[PDB]
Design a protein around this ligand. Structure first.
Ligand SMILES: C[C@]1(C(=O)NC[C@]2(N)[C@@H]3C[C@H]4C[C@@H](C3)C[C@@H]2C4)CN(S(=O)(=O)c2ccc(N3C(=O)CCC3=O)nc2)CCO1
Ligand SMILES: Nc1nccc(-c2c(-c3ccc(F)cc3)ncn2C2CCNCC2)n1
Ligand SMILES: [Ca+2]
Ligand SMILES: [Ca+2]
Ligand SMILES: [Ca+2]
Ligand SMILES: [Ca+2]
Ligand SMILES: [Cl-]
Length: 344
């Protein structure tokens, strides 16, 4: 392909002539994103230019990580790849990586903020998050920072999870075991996040808007109740355990007295997601079977992922080795068919 250059976000982008009318649509993880028109297919796409992908061993491995992950993700509610390109003609010239996915116009914050959502619409939004989570979790991939700004949505409320498996960030949706660095966690960290998101879709208000990690924990405990001694097992810091243990005991609230006028099935699902005991938290696959989603649930259309080889994560390699592996993954990429779906 012939490439052209255009200054976007104060830096030069070099992209194939296939992609036209680039326009900035915000930052991404380790990069920045432009909307574009794919002249090959007439489809709208989003192109992410990674920022300094091989500047350091940290950038280089995270570039490889992200490319490997996105090449593996093939699910309608998870960001995956239509294309990946570089202006480099050889490994020796290779210093820039661009990732292409279908364009999604907004994030979940754009949906709820100016819109009184119906319960049927909330069901659809949460259903899609859970469908995507079932898929990524089945490949032993966890998001760990799921939140409305990491949920891409389009003009028809179709939703995809992004920035999974990888500046002041909001902590309001993080699982307590993540926010407080507890010693053990599982895939259900993301289910806590879904509960926080769903609660906000039902009320219009952030569920746990803490000003710091201690304020947020206090808000959490007011809803779910003081934890038992067994939960302290997970907390390394003695000062943290002593503090939590010292707090005045609080009962769990009945969520039916919290989410007023909500579908009782929504309240029941929230009770199963917003539990401190991550071994008692509902899984994504279990949640998809909950009656709240009855009108959407379809077991034939809730697939799992192919096995995902993450052995590279334990390895320390040199920058040029991560760079060469990344180049290999660029070159071996096989674009998917434009139409990959059929009537049920
Ligand atoms: C959850 C809620 C709320 O108490 N927030 C305070 C807390 N953050 C605080 C105190 C305890 C424990 C912790 C710390 C978590 C919360 C509860 C509820 N209020 S509402 O009552 O004004 C309302 C507002 C809306 C709705 N609604 C509908 O209108 C339809 C469905 C639905 O849920 N239902 C209720 C708005 C703000 O968000
Ligand atoms: N508009 C749009 N549409 C799809 C994806 C993105 C996108 C990507 C991204 C990831 C991989 C890829 F290959 C291409 C783009 N990273 C962050 N975002 C946006 C997510 C919503 N807030 C603005 C940034 N943005
Ligand atoms: Ca119940
Ligand atoms: Ca169906
Ligand atoms: Ca088709
Ligand atoms: Ca079927
Ligand atoms: Cl967010």
């Amino acid at each position: 392909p012939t490439f052209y250059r255009q200054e976007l976000n104060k830096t030069i982008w070099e992209v194939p002539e296939r992609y036209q009318n680039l326009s900035p649509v915000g930052s991404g993880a380790y990069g920045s994103v432009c909307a574009a028109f794919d002249t090959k297919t007439g489809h709208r796409v989003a192109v992410k230019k990674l920022s300094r992908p091989f500047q350091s061993i940290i950038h280089a491995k995270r570039t490889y990580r992200e490319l490997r992950l996105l090449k593996h993700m093939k699910h309608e509610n998870v960001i995956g790849l239509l294309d990946v390109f570089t202006p480099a003609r050889s490994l020796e010239e290779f210093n820039d990586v661009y990732l292409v996915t279908h364009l999604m116009g907004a994030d979940l914050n754009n949906i709820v903020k100016c819109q009184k959502l119906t319960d049927d619409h909330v069901q659809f939004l949460i259903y899609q998050i859970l469908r995507g989570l079932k898929y990524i979790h089945s490949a032993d991939i966890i998001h760990r920072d799921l939140k409305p700004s990491n949920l891409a949505v389009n003009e028809d409320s179709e939703l995809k999870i992004l920035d999974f498996g990888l500046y002041v960030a909001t902590r309001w949706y993080r699982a307590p075991e993540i926010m407080l660095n507890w010693m053990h966690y599982n895939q259900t960290v993301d289910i806590w996040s879904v509960g926080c998101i769903m609660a906000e879709l039902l009320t219009g208000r952030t569920l746990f808007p803490g000003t710091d990690h201690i304020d947020q924990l206090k808000l959490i405990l007011r809803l779910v109740g003081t934890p038992g001694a067994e939960l302290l097992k997970k907390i390394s810091s003695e000062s943290a355990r002593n503090y939590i243990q010292s707090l005045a005991q609080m009962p769990k609230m009945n969520f039916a007295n919290v989410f007023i006028g909500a579908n009782p099935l929504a309240v029941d699902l929230l009770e199963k997601m917003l539990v401190l005991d991550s071994d008692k938290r509902i899984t994504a696959a279990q949640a998809l079977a909950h009656a709240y989603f009855a009108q959407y649930h379809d077991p034939d259309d809730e697939p799992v992922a192919d096995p995902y080889d993450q052995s590279f994560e334990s390895r320390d390699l040199l920058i040029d080795e991560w760079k060469s592996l990344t180049y290999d993954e660029v070159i071996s990429f096989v674009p998917p068919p434009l139409d990959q779906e059929e009537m049920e």
